[model samples]
Target: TSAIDPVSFSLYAKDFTRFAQELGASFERYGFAVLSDYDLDQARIDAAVDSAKAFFALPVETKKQYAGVKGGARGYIPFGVETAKGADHYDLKEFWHMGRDLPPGHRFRAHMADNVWPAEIPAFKHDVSWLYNSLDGMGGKVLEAIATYLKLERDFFKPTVQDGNSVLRLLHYPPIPKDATRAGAHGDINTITLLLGAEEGGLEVLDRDGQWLPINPPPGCLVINIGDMLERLTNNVLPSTVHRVVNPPPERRGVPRYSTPFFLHFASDYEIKTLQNCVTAENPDRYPESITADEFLQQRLREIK
Candidate 1:
């Protein structure tokens, strides 16, 4: 199903080691870049997609039974609650968010609860766990590259990343039989967001020039982008793109689309802000000392549907 041949690059071995620095710099300059040979096997890909489809096929109320109020940090979200962009009031997607599960006896596990599953779709748990761990690895890889791009010592970012305050989101967008207002536009609040574009293809990004640019996943690629944390890390040199989904062609009535994103966050209690290395004594950091990740998560969770 690849529309174009993937633009492969070697970033892994000593063979490709020379160009790794340049590749890292390009990523920091643009906030994202495509890397090839991530190599998710066919079996794994089939299982992931199948599990998501089966879970989403459950009846509306079956999924809704878990509708949460104050603690949605770990459950399903109905449509329209996430007016992602205050400007548009249009995050036209329903979602089920599964937060991380810390091991028992860990104190932070109190705030990081387990996912609430819909009984009708038992497979949701089975596959999402696989997706979570898999993407967790991928995210760490990107984070290392990002750190290198910023000239930080390798693993400097790893300490904040290890606690896995990240979240896994499953989104469902039902097609509008008719055109309506735009879908909600928003930037992710995580350190980095790794996403799979929905099948319907209405996802758009606001470019540097303010033009709305459609970012369709080109063969074997996902729409990976920076989030607010990275923006803070780079101190305005890099940007987290603002994007949203919109209506598809007129005939695609009641169309169904789903997307999943693996979000990376620092430990809830740790401070979130630009690191000292990002700016020098000659150039004092414009950002604050550090805001707790817990506070950042609380503020953004309010916007969820």
Candidate 2:
């Protein structure tokens, strides 16, 4: 009963209301859901993974050349650099981050940094860009369902997320070290996270009963989870569950793990307030004050970096 189930994206076409209800229920209960039959191109995912693996194989110094500024927002973030909030040791992983590319003179241009790609990996940009765009589109559909479930118009999230400061992170958890976990338990800071390649395992979510339950999605499925921002907006109706990637067994420690997660955010200046329906006598208003999406992100980044 506590296990999270895979929801078919195809369900939306057959019965939109039922699909929305199921998706919403999964998030409210477990703060996680696995999506199948989503129709994202497998070849594109494979190509992106190949590019990421090749990039991670480069020498440390070479990889460091693409390290991003503003707390590693748009390029390579080295291992041992990002510590989970309140954790003592760093995660045993390195990653590359890419975000929406704004044209010159765009209003939000100042808020986002330009992406820096590896010169050595010729195919890296093209493959990753494809994955990012695909995930972005899929995320929009998911958000629409969530809005409907919340009793808001289905298009409620369109303006909030369009041209938002979303991020696509390519993660590489290298062979485990004696002292560190793959990623420490922490709630994600964005609105929601859509992940690929979790089939490699080690993903777990902290249930409400204080148990850590493993999340094992079948191949070609995406693992989706609510984030802190959405939890705040919904007054905890949808929780931002704490989750982590555990290290594999000692024998399998020599092998690496790779995954990509798209962190969907509201537009930088969009103020996040608790939804009217989410605030009731029982729930009250957990978040009394409102905060812009960018402000929340910057504050959280300082703590984790």
Worst 10 residues of 1 by lDDT: 1-10
Provide the global lDDT of candidate 1 against the true structure.
Answer: 0.66
The TM-scores of all predictions, comma-separated, are 0.82, 0.92
TM-score, cand. 1: 0.82
- Runs with alpha carbons beyond 4 Å of true place in candidate 2: 81-91, 176-181, 302-305
Clashing pairs in 2: none
Cα misplacement distance, residue 114 of candidate 2 (Å): 0.9
**lDDT digits (tens) for residues 92-182 of candidate 2:** 6788999998888989987788888899999999998999889999999999889998999999999999888999999887874565536
Global CA lDDT computed for model 2: 0.87
lDDT of 2 at 269: 89
lDDT of each: 0.66, 0.87
